[PDB]
Swiss-Prot record:
Signal peptide stretch: none
Protein name per Swiss-Prot or TrEMBL: Protein RecA
Organism per entry: Mycobacterium tuberculosis (strain CDC 1551 / Oshkosh)
Sections of the chain in a coiled coil: none
Function: Can catalyze the hydrolysis of ATP in the presence of single-stranded DNA, the ATP-dependent uptake of single-stranded DNA by duplex DNA, and the ATP-dependent hybridization of homologous single-stranded DNAs. It interacts with LexA causing its activation and leading to its autocatalytic cleavage. PI-MtuI is an endonuclease.
Family, as annotated: Belongs to the RecA family.
Residues at which ATP binds: 63-70
InterPro entries, A to Z: AAA+_ATPase, DNA_recomb/repair_RecA, DNA_recomb/repair_RecA_CS, Hint_dom_C, Hint_dom_N, Hint_dom_sf, Homing_endonucl, INTEIN
PTM (free text): This protein undergoes a protein self splicing that involves a post-translational excision of the intervening region (intein) followed by peptide ligation.
Location of this chain's protein in the cell: Cytoplasm
Length: 307
């Protein structure tokens, strides 16, 4: 009785003293922003609570090599562009495949790219772009590769950590004011600092390879939102990344649809409102890409049932 009031107080003073999202019950409904960058999987967008990535914030996406972490970020880039935004890609891996990026939906032509010489240059260039106020998103690929100038020049170990800590302090304020999202891709360095400056942290893994008739048409991907200052954390989603196509938006609509009851199962058949989507997931997936209207209708309904 008198308990709940004092707790309401404690929480309010906490949010007041350290920002909204400094504490929350895991069963809470997220505080929903107006603009947000969708990820490409509605399932992941739901996992993130707020229907996508937050603006003006630091995001980390980490995983092993061949996990999908980069793919996820490229969709972030693509959706940001699709809403008339401007994207940058600070690159210290030299790994990007623009053809893949296009098929996925990236306007590579408009994509700003820098291939910096040093870790500090990478972050400084990134900061200059952020401070312009013209960017909707900037991706840093990747943390591990951000070698410090002293180490590249020959010359004080644990410097990477000092570099990042310094840079992220300055970068955090710039992002908040610009409304620009910074995504830092990270391999399994200066990830110690990024762990705490980041508003969202996503652990990305590939779990099993999707079997075609006889060959492999991509693989099933699992993402755990390990840190989330924007909505109850620890949520996780799965979705399909398809060889040379990207994240199966339609596949994820089907998954979240059945999970949400909007799509029932007449055995193998997937049914929507008494109409049949397809026999087995591959047909149901196909049907929804052939029919944008029904896919959009489902995506519309899933969101309505949630936020």
């Amino acid at each position: 009785p008198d308990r709940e009031k004092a707790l309401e107080l404690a929480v309010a003073q906490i949010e007041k003293s350290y920002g909204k999202g400094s504490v929350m019950r895991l069963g809470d409904e997220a505080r929903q922003p107006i603009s947000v960058i969708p990820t490409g999987s509605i399932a992941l967008d739901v996992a993130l609570g707020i229907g996508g990535l937050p603006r003006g914030r630091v995001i980390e996406i980490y995983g092993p090599e061949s996990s999908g972490k980069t793919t996820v970020a490229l969709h972030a880039v693509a959706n940001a562009q699709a809403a008339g935004g401007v994207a940058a890609f600070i690159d210290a891996e030299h790994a990007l495949d623009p053809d893949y990026a296009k098929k996925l939906g990236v306007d590579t032509d408009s994509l700003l790219v820098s291939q910096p010489d040093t870790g500090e240059q990478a972050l400084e260039i990134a900061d200059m772009l952020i401070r312009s106020g013209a960017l909707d998103i900037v991706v840093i690929d990747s943390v591990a590769a951000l070698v410090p100038r002293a180490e590249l020049e020959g010359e004080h170990v644990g410097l990477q950590a000092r570099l990042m800590s310094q840079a992220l302090r300055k970068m955090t304020g710039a992002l908040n004011n610009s409304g620009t999202t910074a995504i830092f891709i990270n391999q399994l360095t200066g990830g110690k600092a990024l762990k705490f400056y980041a508003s969202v942290r996503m652990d990305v893994r590939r779990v099993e390879t999707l079997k075609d008739g006889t060959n492999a048409v991509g693989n099933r991907t699992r993402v755990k939102v390990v840190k989330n200052k924007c909505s109850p954390p620890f949520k996780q989603a799965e979705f399909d990344i398809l060889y040379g196509k990207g994240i199966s938006r339609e596949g994820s609509l089907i998954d979240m649809g059945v999970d949400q009851g909007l799509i029932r199962k007449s055995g193998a058949w997937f049914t929507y409102e008494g109409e049949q989507l397809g026999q087995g997931k591959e047909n149901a997936r196909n049907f929804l890409v052939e029919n944008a209207d029904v896919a959009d209708e489902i995506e519309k309904k899933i969101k309505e049932k949630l936020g």
